[PDB]
């Protein structure tokens, strides 16, 4: 509602980013989502046999592929439910290092993703000299924690959206938000 371009970034653009994307879009935010991994990773029959796909593979196709391997197994572990939710948001997972979109706020869901996002934007030369705030809100990679994390991220973006001058208030806003929730929220600035 405040014209803020928001991005939520994780590893695979499958679980945590899409849960936050889901709630941010329903609140009317200009939101996108990306993963920072090299390929999309989804769990499976064991730790040693994860389902790995190339970024750009449609959620529809990954749904049908998992449906054919073991439809009953991938319904009781929630992956088909998750793929269906993502299918209804956008076509395919996207890699953050490949996008040419620019944002006002970028939210990562763990420090590893934060580091990848920072190293990427620093590896590019500044052209527009446009700053973007990069925030880290830690979210554990499971269904229950992605849900709680998506609430924290949505609440955080909503509080920042209500500011009349976000740049002048963001440090104090994060400060209070952190204290209220006993979290550490890393926060730096990068340039396009």
């Amino acid at each position: 509602p405040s014209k803020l371009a928001v991005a939520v970034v994780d590893s695979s653009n499958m679980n945590r980013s899409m849960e936050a994307h889901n709630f941010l879009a329903k609140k009317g935010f200009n939101v996108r989502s990306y993963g920072t991994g090299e390929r999309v990773k989804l769990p499976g029959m064991a730790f040693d046999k994860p389902n790995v796909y190339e970024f750009g593979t449609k959620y529809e196709d990954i749904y049908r592929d998992l449906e054919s391997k073991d439809k009953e197994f991938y319904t009781q572990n929630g992956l088909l439910h998750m793929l269906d939710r993502n299918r209804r948001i956008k076509k395919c997972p996207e890699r953050f290092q490949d996008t040419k979109e620019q944002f006002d706020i970028i939210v990562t869901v763990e420090e590893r993703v934060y580091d990848l996002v920072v190293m990427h934007m620093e590896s590019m030369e500044s052209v527009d000299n446009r700053p973007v705030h990069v925030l880290n809100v830690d979210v554990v990679n499971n269904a229950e924690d992605a849900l709680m994390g998506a609430f924290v991220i949505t609440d955080m973006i909503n509080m920042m959206a209500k500011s009349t001058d976000l740049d002048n208030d963001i440090d104090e806003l994060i400060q209070e938000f952190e204290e209220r929730r006993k979290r550490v929220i890393l926060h730096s600035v990068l340039f396009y």
Binding site: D10, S12, K41, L42, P43, N141, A143
Partner: peptide, 5 residues
């Protein structure tokens, strides 16, 4: 790693 783990 995998999402979810």
């Amino acid at each position: 790693p995998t999402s979810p783990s």
